[PDB]
Structure formats: structure tokens, C-alpha cells
Amino acid sequence: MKPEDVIKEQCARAKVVAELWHGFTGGAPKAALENLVVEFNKAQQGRCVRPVPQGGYRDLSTKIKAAFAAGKVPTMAQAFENNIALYLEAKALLPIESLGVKLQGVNLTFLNAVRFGGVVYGVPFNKSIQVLYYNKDLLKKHGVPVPATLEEFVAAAKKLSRAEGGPVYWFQPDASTFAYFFFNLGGSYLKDGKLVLNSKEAVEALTLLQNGVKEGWAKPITSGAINQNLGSGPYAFSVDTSAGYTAYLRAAKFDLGVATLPGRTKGQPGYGLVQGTNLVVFRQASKEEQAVAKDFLEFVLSPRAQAVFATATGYVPVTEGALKDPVYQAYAAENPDYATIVRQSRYAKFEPALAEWEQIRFDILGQAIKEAILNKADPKAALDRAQKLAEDLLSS
């Protein structure tokens, strides 16, 4: 009796059913969402949510565009900030505060990100922050302090790779990893309102990674998640989503470290990329489905729902209330990595919220990073190409 079995039964006897389309394909996010929905549905009187997996996040946005085309949309769905921008062009989204959902206490880092022209269009739900995952045992073995600066991080990666005979910093050659180096070398994607992929800081970020590959301290991972490659050769450090925390804990055969990210100086942690999603409510949904979404959105913002969800996953509890819940506190008191994730969430950057950003981050910027890392393309020539494809798509 999988939670999804329970839910299908709950929905089969419900008077009213609001679909929630998501992009959790498995593991702890998928288990945590479904357990939340089972609990919500037991409380309700013939009024249920039905989570519908749509694949990953891009499958989900593709399926949502086909839904507008078909005229069959869900009540709710997961959405990045760029997805929200897109669906607003379509006039598809219900303003949240119209349902009377109370948003005070939601972290302004996340609340600001769902606000378009003053209006909130999303409920921050599963929001993650990059952290530094590390191998405590391997750093102790070579007397390496947890690096607090980008300088110390390069140094440690070179020191440990020399000692162990192989690259100890592991990375996915993607926009998400790029963003960490880009932000903390003083990059910004927007200059005088214009999207710029090929700035000096972008070239310096992509150069740093490619030189790490050439020098033997950076290891590109091209098959599975980082946590799925552990046990193959020496590992000291990744920069990865907090939402992988439970997966790291399960897979690591070594004592797993979580730290705040290396910054430019010791005066502050580096910035982590905010990932994960918001829940949106579609205007096309029935008044009755909307009422279910309003109770569901209130439930998901409750201290207990956030304390259970965040502690099952490593996602960042989106409310001040969740940190004051005793189930959170019990987990935090036993595992310092939960406070570490919250501390890192204070130092948080977003990618641009342009309608076209999902296509750019994957098919243009992501590609130019793969070209440099995996095919030895010159970092500037790869980014100049990206900039030109992005300027051509935005002109379309």
C-alpha cells in the first residue's frame, strides 16, 4: 500500500478533486509530497488533491503547455519563477491572495520571487539552496580545513586530488553548477535590463571549471546525480542542491559533511542558487477545485507540513513558523546539517525570471558549458555562441 495507492482510493470517493501536476520522479521529494497529500486528504470531507507525476520539471512544463493547447489544465502545478512568467503571458494563473491564502511569515527570499508587478502568483513549496557537500574523512585524512573561500576551495581540491591521485571536486557540467561560480566571481546575468551569458565573470567561471578538469582536481559527472556516482574514486566536495541531502546521507559510505558555500571572503558565505518550485493555481480550474487548492496551500504552509517536508528532503522550510515547530526542532537538535541548510538559505541568488529562461539554461547556456567541459571548446567562444543564440531566441 504505497501512498499513491491510498491517494487513488481517497480521490475515488471524493466529491471534488484538484489535480496537482509535479516533477518529482522518485526518492524522498516524491515520498514526502505524497505523505503530505495522504494527511491533507484524511482531514478533508470528500475533497482531495491528486498528485500526478509528469516526469521531471521540464517534462512538467512541456505537459502544462500541451494542457493549455488541449484546454485541460490541472488545478495546481509546480513552477519555477521563469515558468510563472511564461504562464502569465498566457493569463493562466490565479493571483494567490485572491483565494485568501495568508502569506505573512513566508521568507521574503521566496515570496519576493513569486511576485510579478506587485502580485503573488505562486506559493513557495519545495525551495532548495546549494550547499557544500563534503567528505569529512578525506579532508581529516590530509589535514584540510573545510574551505571558507573560493581560493581555499581551489587549494583544497588541488591538495586532495594530488594526495588521492584523482579529481576530488565532483560537478555536473550544467547552468546550476555554473551559477555558483558565476555569482561568487561577481557575475550577473542582467546588465541594463539585457540578458548577458558571455560577460567577463561568465568566461572566468567557465574557465575555472575547465582548468579544474585539465589540472586534475575537477571531475565532470555525465551519468546520474553526484550522489549516484559516490564509491567510484576519491570524493571530497560537491556543490549541489540541498534537496539531494537525504540521498547523499543514504549513499555516502564515508562521514558526509554539509557546510555553507565558499565565498569571495570569510566575511560572508558564498551565494547558493535557489532551486525547486512554487505551487500555482490555474484560472481555468473550477471554483470548487480552487477552494480545495486554498485549503491545500494553507496546509502546505503550516509549520508541521513544512517541518516534516524539509526534514524528509533537505529542502529549506519556507516559513519562520516551520523553524519554531517541535518536529523540526527535534530533527535539528539531532542533526546540525538542517541549521546549515537554513544558514545557507540566507545567502541566496535566483536565475532570471524571463519566460524563455528554461530553454536558455538547458539548450543554450547548458550546451555551451558542456561544449567547454566535455569537448574542450574555448570558454569565451562557447559563451559568445550562447549569447548569440539567446539574443536570437529573445528577438523571436
Ligand X SMILES: Nc1nc2c(ncn2[C@@H]2O[C@H](COP(=O)(O)O[C@H]3[C@@H](O)[C@H](n4ccc(=O)[nH]c4=O)O[C@@H]3CO)[C@H]3CC(O)(O)C[C@H]32)c(=O)[nH]1
Give contact residues for ligand X (rule: CB under 6 A): 24, 27, 29, 56-58, 61, 80, 82, 126, 128, 174, 176, 225, 227-228, 241, 243-244, 247, 275-276, 357-358, 361
Residues in Cβ contact with 326 at an 8 Å cutoff, skipping those fewer than 6 apart: none
Of these partners, ligand X, Cl ion, none, which one is at the site of residue 358 (CB under 5 to 8 Å by kind)? ligand X
Query: What gap in Å lies between CA 312 and CA 306, rounded to an integer?
Result: 10
- Least Å from the CB of residue 53 to Cl ion: 10
**Nearest by Cα to 345 from 96, 106, 24, 56:** 106
Closer Cβ to ligand X, 24 or 309, answer by number: 24
Closer Cβ to Cl ion, 38 or 163, answer by number: 38
- Least Å from the CB of residue 29 to Cl ion: 10
Cell numbers representing residue 264 in the block: 569571495
Closer Cβ to ligand X, 29 or 321, answer by number: 29
Name the residue number minimizing CB distance to ligand X.
244
- Least Å from the CB of residue 180 to ligand X: 12
Closer Cβ to ligand X, 229 or 290, answer by number: 229
**Nearest by Cα to 285 from 7, 107, 73:** 73
Cell numbers representing residue 95 in the block: 493571483
- Looking at residues 9 to 68 of the shown chain, list those that interact with Cl ion (rule: CB under 5 A): 26
Closer Cβ to Cl ion, 26 or 145, answer by number: 26
Cell numbers representing residue 333 in the block: 537538535
Where are the extended beta strands (E) located within the chain? Answer: 16-22, 47-53, 76-79, 115-116, 119-120, 123-135, 169-171, 190-191, 194-195, 218-220, 237-241, 256-259, 272-281, 348-349
- Least Å from the CB of residue 314 to Cl ion: 17
Cell numbers representing residue 2 in the block: 504505497
Q: Treating both helix axes as pointing N-terminal to C-terminal, what angle do 27-43 and 3-12 enclose, rounded to 10 degrees?
A: 30
Closer Cβ to Cl ion, 28 or 236, answer by number: 28
- Least Å from the CB of residue 27 to Cl ion: 5
Binding flag, residue 2, Cl ion (CB under 5 A) = no
Of these partners, ligand X, Cl ion, none, which one is at the site of residue 221 (CB under 5 to 8 Å by kind)? none
- Least Å from the CB of residue 251 to ligand X: 8
Of these partners, Cl ion, ligand X, none, which one is at the site of residue 177 (CB under 5 to 8 Å by kind)? none
181-211 burial, b at 16+ Cβ within 10 Å, e below that, comes to: bbbbbebebeeeeebbbbbebbbebbbbbbe
Closer Cβ to ligand X, 89 or 192, answer by number: 89
- Least Å from the CB of residue 69 to ligand X: 19
SS3 state of residue 234: coil
Residues binding Cl ion (CB under 5 A)? 26
